[PDB]
Amino acid sequence: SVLTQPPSVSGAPGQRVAISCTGSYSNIGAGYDVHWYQQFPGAAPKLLIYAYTNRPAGVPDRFSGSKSGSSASLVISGLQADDEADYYCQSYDARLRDGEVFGGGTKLTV
Amino acid sequence: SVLTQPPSVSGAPGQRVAISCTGSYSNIGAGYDVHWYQQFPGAAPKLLIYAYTNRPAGVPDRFSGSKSGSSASLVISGLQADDEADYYCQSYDARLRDGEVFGGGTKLTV
Amino acid sequence: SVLTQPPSVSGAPGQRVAISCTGSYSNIGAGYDVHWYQQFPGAAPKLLIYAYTNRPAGVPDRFSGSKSGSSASLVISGLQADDEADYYCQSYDARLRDGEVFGGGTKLTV
Amino acid sequence: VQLVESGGNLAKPGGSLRLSCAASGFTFSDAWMTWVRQAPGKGLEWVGRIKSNADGGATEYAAPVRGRFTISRDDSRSSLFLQMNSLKTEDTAVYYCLTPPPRRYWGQGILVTVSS
Amino acid sequence: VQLVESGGNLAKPGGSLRLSCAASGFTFSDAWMTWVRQAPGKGLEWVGRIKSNADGGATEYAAPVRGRFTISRDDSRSSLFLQMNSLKTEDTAVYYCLTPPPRRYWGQGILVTVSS
Amino acid sequence: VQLVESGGNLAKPGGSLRLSCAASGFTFSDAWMTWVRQAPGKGLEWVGRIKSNADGGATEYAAPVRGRFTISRDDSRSSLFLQMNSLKTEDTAVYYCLTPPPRRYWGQGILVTVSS
Amino acid sequence: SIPLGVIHNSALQVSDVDKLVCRDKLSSTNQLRSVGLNLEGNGVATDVPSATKRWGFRSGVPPKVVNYEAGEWAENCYNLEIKKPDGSECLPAAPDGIRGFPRCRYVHKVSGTGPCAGDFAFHKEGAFFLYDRLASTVIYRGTTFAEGVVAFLILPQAKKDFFYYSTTIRYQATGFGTNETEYLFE
Amino acid sequence: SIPLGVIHNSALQVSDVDKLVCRDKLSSTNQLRSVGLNLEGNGVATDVPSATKRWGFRSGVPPKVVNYEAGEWAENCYNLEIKKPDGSECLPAAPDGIRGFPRCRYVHKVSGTGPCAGDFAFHKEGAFFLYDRLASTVIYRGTTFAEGVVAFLILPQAKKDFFYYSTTIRYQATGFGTNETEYLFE
Amino acid sequence: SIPLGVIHNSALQVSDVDKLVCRDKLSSTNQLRSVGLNLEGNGVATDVPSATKRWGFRSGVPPKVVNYEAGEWAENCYNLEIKKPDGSECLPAAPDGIRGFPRCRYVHKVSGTGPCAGDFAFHKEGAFFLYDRLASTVIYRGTTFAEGVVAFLILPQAKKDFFYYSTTIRYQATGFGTNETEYLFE
Amino acid sequence: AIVNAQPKCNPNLHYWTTQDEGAAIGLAWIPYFGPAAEGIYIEGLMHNQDGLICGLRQLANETTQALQLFLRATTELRTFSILNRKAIDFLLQRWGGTCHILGPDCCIEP
Amino acid sequence: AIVNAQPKCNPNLHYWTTQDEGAAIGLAWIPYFGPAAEGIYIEGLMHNQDGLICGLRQLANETTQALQLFLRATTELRTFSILNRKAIDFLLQRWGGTCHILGPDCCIEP
Amino acid sequence: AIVNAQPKCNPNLHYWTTQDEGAAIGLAWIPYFGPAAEGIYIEGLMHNQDGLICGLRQLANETTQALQLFLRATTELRTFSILNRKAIDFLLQRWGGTCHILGPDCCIEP
Ligand SMILES: *[C@@H]1O[C@H](CO)[C@@H](O[C@@H]2O[C@H](CO)[C@@H](O)[C@H](O)[C@H]2NC(C)=O)[C@H](O)[C@H]1NC(C)=O
Ligand SMILES: *[C@@H]1O[C@H](CO)[C@@H](O[C@@H]2O[C@H](CO)[C@@H](O)[C@H](O)[C@H]2NC(C)=O)[C@H](O)[C@H]1NC(C)=O
Ligand SMILES: *[C@@H]1O[C@H](CO)[C@@H](O[C@@H]2O[C@H](CO)[C@@H](O)[C@H](O)[C@H]2NC(C)=O)[C@H](O)[C@H]1NC(C)=O
Question: Which domain holds residue D99?
C-alpha cells in the first residue's frame, strides 16, 4: 500500500515533463487528496501542490497537476536549472486506518 | 453584599469535595455569572471556571460546578496532592453599580 | 491636476479654523475619497481623516471634515499649542490613470 | 497574551504613586480592563474598571477607593494607568491588571507598601 | 509560523529518547500534528499523528513503530512531544514535526543516530 | 504594524540604487503597496503603486518617473522593492513605503541624495 | 381561526367565518389589509422605567416575524444598547432588511449594562415589537421600535374613505431589567 | 403532477386530478396535510453499517428543503461527526432553524474520518432526511435525522378520527463511506 | 395592476382585468408563466463602453429580486471585477443561490478600478439584471448577467405550441463609470 | 359587534402606508432615480366617526392570542402568506362543494 | 386503489404533530411564559383498520419521484407553498371556466 | 392590441426553460445519480408568425414600470408569489360575489 513513482526523470531545458504517482482503489481511487513536495539537497521539503491541482501562494505557475483514475501526475513545463530537486507524492490510505502514505521519490536532472 | 465561602475544607485523597459560595437576590440570584479562581502560594491566580459551569482550555475535567438558587458550588472529585490551593468565587453585584464582588476564599488541605 | 490648498492659516487659541482643498470634476467631484494627513517637523505624517469625514481610532474628536461640490474642508475647533503641523490633502485623479494626487500643504500657526 | 505591570513602589502617607500595565498579543482597544488589589496574606479585592472608548470610556471605582484613585488608558500605547493619590494607611497590597472574561489572564503583580 | 525541534541526540540500543517541537505564529490547539522520519539518503516516511483535544486527542502510529513510540501534546506550552523507547537498530533518521495541510510548513529536523 | 525601510544612500548621476521595505504585523500579500517621495523642505509626492498578486500584480508609475523606476514585491520575504535607475539631478528626497487606506501607517523614511 | 374584521357602512363587525352570510363582498385581493396599532393609544404608561418592566429575557424559544402593510404614527419609540458587565452583547444584531420604525416624535435611546439572563428578550404581555413593516417577537440591537399589535381587515370597495422631525433622549442605565435599576438622563 | 391521496370512509384512494369527480368535499385549507413516514417501517435493515451504505457524496447539485406538518415516531436516528484525515469538515453546519428530529428512541452518534469525496451527501435511493418538520436532500453536521418520505392528503371533514426518553450509542469509524470501513462501538 | 398578457389563437392581447370577458379559459396554474427577454433583441448598442454607461451607483435604496421561469438565449453577457484605487470591493458578493446566466455566446469579463461612488449599482433605464432564473435590481460581484425585462403570460391549453459553448473576452479598465474611461482589451 | 373595553381610546388614527401603484412622474419609478428608502410613505388622518376607531383597536387586541398560537406552530422565519390563505379559505367555503340552489349556503338568486 | 408492495408493513402509526389552535390555559400562549421548543408536540396512535396504513405508506413511496422532479426545477431554497398551489388548482379546474349545467364537469344539481 | 414601437425586432425567439415533469429514465430523477446543475435545461426555437414576437417583446417593456413600483413597496427580499396572487385575483373577480344570471359578469349559460 505504498504509492510508487519512477526512480528518475530527465529532459532538456525548455521542454515539458510529467511525473507519475501510481495509486490504488483504497488510496487515490477511493477519493483522498494527493499532495506533492519538493526537497532541495540539504533542506527540508516545501509544499508544491497542496490538493490535486491547487498551488499555495508563492509557487510559480509552471507547476500543475491532474488526476486520472487511480493515478496522479505532476506536470512541469519549462525546465530551468533551478528545477533540480527530489519530488515526493503523498496520500491517505483507507485500509491503513487513514494513515499517510509517501511515494518512493523522483530525482530530477536537466 | 459580599459572597461568603467556608474558611477551609479537607478530604482524604481520592474522594470528592464541594466548595460552597453563598449569594443574594441581587448577586447570584439576579442572574449574573459566577467565576472561580485558583491561587497557588506565591503566584497569581488562574481562571478555573469562567462561567457557572464552563472550563477554559487546559483545565482538567476533575473540576466542575453548578448553581442552585442563589448559591454556587464548585465540585472537585479525586483529590490529588497538587490540589492544595486557595479558591475564590467572584460575581457582579447589581446594587453596587454592577461592581465586582469577591468571596472570602477557601484553603484546601489533603 | 493637483489639489491646491492655502499656503498657511492662523488663528488665536480657542477658536475654530477651516482648511480648504480645491478639487476638479475628475478629482473630487468625480467621486473619489479625500484623505488628510498631519506631519510634525522631523517626523513621518500620520493619518488624520481616512475618508471624507471618518476618523481612525486615537484621533481626538476636535478634527472633522466635510465635502461641498468639488472641494473638501477640514474643520479644527479649539486650537491648542499642539496643533502646529503641516496638513496635506490627498485624492485619486481619474484622468491620470487613477494616480494619487497630493495637495500643496498648509502650515498651521497659533 | 502578555501583560506586564511596572513603575510602582512604596509611597509615604499622603503620597501619589502611578502604576502602569502593558498588554500584548490582543487588541487592547476593544477590551474592558479592570484592576484588582490583594491584601498580603488575605482575600482578593476589586479596585475598579474602565470601559472601552467605543462605549464612552466611563470608569467605575470601588466604594473605599472612590475619589482617590483614577483609571485611564492609551490605545496607541496599549497601556492602562492607575493613579493612586492621598495614599493613607492600609493601602498596602499586590495590584493586578486583568482582561475581560473569558480568558482573564491576570498579570504578574506589583507590590505597593505605604511606609510610615 | 515558526516550528523549532529540540532535545534529541544519539541513544544506545534499547534506549529511550524524547524529542520536542515548539510551534509559534498559529493556534496550536486546533491543528492536528504529525511526525515524519526520513532515512539518511532515502525516501520520506510517516511516524504518526495526534488529533486535536476537541476531537478526543486520539493518536495513531505507523505499523513498524506501533507500541514503541508515544505522541503527546501540551496546549498551554504549545509543544508536541515524541517518546521513542526500546530503540533498536535501523531507527536512525531525521525527524520532523509538520502542521495540517494546507500550509504544512515542515520544521528544520532533528538527527537521531542509534549507536552500537 | 511595523514598516522598516533600508538599503539606500547617495548615488552618482546615472546611478542605480535599490531600496527595500520590510513589513510586519499584518498580511503583506493581500495589501496594495505604494511609494511616496517628499522633496526636502517641500510638498509630498507619489512615486507609484503595486497591486496585489491576486489582482494580477500590475504596477503603475508617476509621469516623471515612468520608465526609470521599477516596483516589485516578495510575498515570502514580505518585502517591497524599489529600483531607481538612470538617477539624474533633482531626484533627491525622503522615500516612504505606505500601506493601503485605512490605517496607512507610513514608515520612517530613507534619504536619497544624488551627488554631482 | 384568526379574527377577520369586515367594515360595513362606516362600522366594524368581526366577520364570523363558520356561518356563511354572503352580503359581504370581496371582489379582489386589494381589499385585504393588515394594520399595526400602538399600545400607547390604549393608555399604557410610557415612562421609560415603566415601559422596560414589560420586557424579559428567555431561552429556548425561536423568534418569529410577521409583516404588516399599514401603521400608526408613534409618539414614543425605544432604542436599546445593553451590554453585560464584562462587556458583551446580549441583544442580536438586526437581520437583513429589518429597519427602524419610520415615524416617531421621540426616540428614547438607552445605554448601559445588565445581567441579560436569557437568549432573547420577549414582551411579558404578549404584544409585538413593531419595526418598518415587520413585527417581531424579539428585540434587536440598535434598532428603534414601537410596541404594538396587528389586526386584519376587509376594506370596503371604495378606495377613498380608507388610507417630519425626530428627537433623541439619552439615558444611561445599570442593573437594566432588575428589581432596582439605575437611570441617568443626560 | 404529484399524487394527492384522498381519504374516503376509512379508506385511502389516490385522487385522480385529470378527471373531475365532485363527491370529494374540500371545504377548507385545514383538510390539507403533509405527512412524513419512516423507511424503517418498510423493513429496511437498520444496522449502522447497512444504513451508511445508502449515502454518498456528490458535487454540483444544489440542496433543497421542503416542509411537512406531521410525522412518525422513529426507532432509529443517526448523528454524524465526520472529518477528513488531515482534519477538516466535510458536512456543512445546520442552517438557521433546522433542528433535530423530535422523537427517536435511539440516536446512533458516529464519529471518525473519511475521504468525503464530494460537496454534499445524498441518499442513493432518492429518499429524504427528515428533521424537525423540514425534509432535506442533504445531511447537515451534528444534527439528528431520520430516513423518510413525504405524502400529501385531503383529510376527512371530521377532526377526531385523524391526528419520552432517548439513548445515545457511540461509534468510532475510519474509512467511512468506503468499501471496507472500520467501526468500534463504545 | 401589472399587465397580464393572454395568448389567443396564435396572437397576443393584453388581458384587461377591470372588465370580465370570460371567453379566456384558465383551468390550472400550469398555464401561468413568467418570461425574461433580452434588451439586445430591441437593438440597443452592445459595445462594452456603450453598455457600461447605462449603469450607475446609488446609496439608500434596498435591492430586490424576483424570479422568472423561462428565458432567452443571450448573445452578450457581462462579468465585472471592479475595485477602488486603494483596493477594496465596491460590488457585493453573490448571495446564496444566485448563479450566472446559463446561455450566452460571449462573456465580456471586465477588470479594473473606479470610484464606485455608491452602495449599489442600478440600471439607469430601470431594466433588470438577469441571472439564472432570478432578476435583481443590482449587480453582484463576479457573476455573469444579461440585461433584460420580465413579462407574465397565460399560456394556451395546448402544451406543444409553446415551450453549447462560451467565449470570454477580457478587458482592463481605469476610471470605470466616469466621463472618460480607459479600456484595453487583451 | 365589538365593544371597546380599554382604559382609553385615542379616537384619532394618524396613519402611514405605501402606495403600491402611484401615478409616477416620468423617471421617478426607476430605482436609480427614484426616492430613497425613507421617502416612499404616504400619510393621512381618520377620525372616530361612527365609533369605528375604538372598535378597530379592540379587534387588534382580540387577534393577538390566536396570531401567537399560529406563529408558534410554523417553522417559517418570516410569514408573508396569511392574507392569501384567508382568501383561499373564503373561496373554498363557498365553491368548494356542490351548490344546491335554495340551500342556506349557496348564494345564487335565480 | 393502492396495494402495498413493500417487504413489510408496520401496521401501527404512532404519530406526532402540532396543534395550531390549542385551547390555551391563561398565559401559556405568551412566548415568554409558554413551553420551550421541545414541548409543543402532541402524540397519538392509529391502527391498521380497513388496511389503511399499508395504503398510506405505499402512497408516500409513489410520491417521491414526482416530488424530486419538482424540487430540481425550483430555485427556492425552502418550499412552503405546495398545499396552496394544490388548493388553487382544485378551485381552477372546477370554476376556472364556463359551467354548463348537465355537463360532466359542472357539479350543480338543480 | 399591442403594436411594437422598438427600434428593431429580432423576430426569432431562441428560448430555454426547465421541464418540471420530464419522463425520467430510471435513476435519473435521483439527485445523487441525476444531471449536474448545468444540464437541466431544454431549448427551442419560435419564429415571428402572426407578428406575435414583436408583440411579446413590447409587452415586456410596458410591464417594467408597474413591476418596479410593486417591488419598491414590498419588504420581501425574493418574490416568488406574483403568479399565485394573479390566479387568486382571477378567481375572486368571478366568484367572489353573488352571481346573478343574465348579468354581464356572471358567465353561466343555462
Ligand atoms: C388586550 O387588552 C387587555 C385589557 O386592557 C390587556 O390586559 C392586561 O393583561 C396584563 C397581563 O397580561 C395585566 O397586567 C393587565 O391588568 C390587563 N389589563 C387590564 C385592563 O386588566 C391585554 O394585555 C391586551 N392584549 C395584549 C396582547 O396586549
Ligand atoms: C419505493 O419502494 C420500492 C420497493 O420497496 C423501493 O425500491 C428499491 O430500489 C432500490 C434501488 O433504488 C433497490 O436496491 C431495491 O431492491 C428496490 N426495492 C425492491 C423491493 O426491489 C424504492 O426505493 C422506494 N422508493 C424510495 C424513494 O425509497
Ligand atoms: C421601453 O422602450 C422604450 C423605447 O425604446 C425605452 O425608452 C427609452 O428611455 C431612455 C431613458 O429612460 C432614453 O434614453 C431612450 O431614448 C428611450 N427610447 C427611445 C426610443 O427614445 C425604455 O427604456 C424601455 N423600457 C425599459 C424598462 O427599458
Answer: 1-116
Q: Calculate how close chain J gets to L51, using CA atoms only, in Å.
A: 30
- Residue J92: DSSP 8-state: H
* Nearest 10 degrees: Cα torsion A86, A92, A95, A99: 80
Resolution as reported, in Å: 3.0
Element (H, E) at A108: strand A106-109
Residues β-bridged to residue C14: none
Chain J residues with CB-CB distance to K94 below 8 A: 95
Q: How far is L28 from chain H (nearest CA, A)?
A: 10
Query: ∠ CA B35-B36-B39 to the nearest 5 degrees?
Result: 140
Subunit contact B33:D101, Cβ cutoff 8 A: yes
Amino acid identity of H155? L
Q: How many domains does chain D have?
A: 1
Q: Which three cell numbers stand for residue C70?
A: 468639488
CA angle B55, B57, B62 (to 5 degrees): 50
How many whole angstroms from H57 Cα to the centroid of ligand 3?
Answer: 49
Contact yes or no, D with K (3+ CB pairs under 8 Å): no
Q: Is any atom of ligand 3 closer than 6 Å to the C-beta of I125? A: yes
A64 neighbors A4 (Cβ within 8 angstroms): no
Q: How far apart are CA I57 and CA C68, in angstroms?
A: 19
Cα H91 to Cα H94: distance, rounded to the nearest angstrom = 9
What are A104's strand-pairing partners? none
- Cell numbers representing residue D89 in the block: 494607611
Q: Would you give the DSSP letter of residue I93? A: B
Spatial neighbors of I154 by CB under 8 A, at least 6 apart, are: I4, I5, I6, I7, I15, I24, I26, I31, I32, I33
Q: Which residues of A touch F (CB under 8 A)?
A: 57-58
Place of cell 488589589: D37
**D-chain residues near C58 (CB < 8 A):** 75-76
The rounded distance, in Å, linking the Cα atoms of A13 and E47 is: 37
Q: Is the CB of I126 under 6 A from ligand 3?
A: yes
Ligand 2: which of K4, K8, K61 to mutate, judged by most atoms within 8 Å of the beta carbon? K61
Q: Which of residues 6-35 of D touch C (CB under 8 A)?
A: 29
The amino acid occupying position K109 is E
CA of residue J44 to ligand 1 center, whole Å: 29
The rounded distance, in Å, linking the Cα atoms of K90 and H6 is 13
Give yes or no for E56 touching A (CB within 8 A). Answer: no
Q: What is the DSSP letter of C27?
A: T
- Whether the CB-CB separation of C88 and C41 falls below 8 Å is answered with no
| Alpha-carbon span H75 to H73, nearest angstrom | 7
* Boundaries of domain holding G34: 1-186
What 3-state class would DSSP assign to C39? strand
Q: Determine the Cα–Cα distance for residues G94 and I118; give it in Å rounded to an integer.
A: 22
Q: How many domains does chain I have?
A: 1
C-beta atoms surrounding B5 within 10 Å: 20
DSSP at G89: B
State the Cα–Cα distance between residues G34 and C15, nearest whole angstrom. Answer: 56
H/E element holding I185? strand I182-185
Total number of domains in chain A: 1
Contact yes or no for C66/C74 (Cβ under 8 A): no
SS3 for J85?
Answer: helix
Yes or no, beta carbons of I62 and J37 under 8 Å apart: yes
How far apart, in whole angstroms, are the C-alpha atoms of residue I51 and residue I183? 13
Residues β-bridged to residue E96: E36
The H or E element spanning position K91 is helix K82-95
Q: How far is CA F39 from CA C3, F20, F33, in A?
A: 17, 19, 20
For chain D, list the contacting chains (3+ Cβ pairs, <8 Å). B, C, G
Range of the domain at C46: 1-110
Hey, is the C-beta of C30 within 8 angstroms of any chain I C-beta? yes
Residue nearest to atom 18 of ligand 1 (CA): J6
